[PDB]
Design a protein around this nucleic acid. Structure first.
Length: 70
DNA sequence: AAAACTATGCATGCTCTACTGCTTCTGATCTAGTCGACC
């Protein structure tokens, strides 16, 4: 689950553990935020979202199911 | 011609400085195992 306020991002797991270190707390750093920051529309500054985090292979353009690996 | 003084060489001990071999300490590497958290 992702919390967004302006340029500030925060991520939480199923049981409540912080994961912002991995996914980035600002567009300058991270593994997802620098690329998803510009996806949001002009009028949206505060947001809470819930979803799944997955691994994507661009070569085959396919989701790699995280059975137990990668 | 005989006796006293001195020079030089050599033996002797002790002290000091390189080289080889044994023992111990450190670093580097690999292998095995543990823990967080997800599902």
């Amino acid at each position: 689950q992702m919390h967004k306020d302006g340029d500030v991002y925060k991520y939480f797991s199923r049981n409540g553990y912080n994961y912002t270190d991995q996914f980035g707390a600002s567009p300058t750093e991270g593994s997802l935020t620098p690329f998803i920051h510009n996806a949001f529309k002009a009028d949206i500054q505060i947001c809470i979202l819930d979803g799944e985090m997955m691994a994507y292979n661009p070569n085959t353009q396919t989701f790699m199911q995280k059975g137990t690996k990668f």
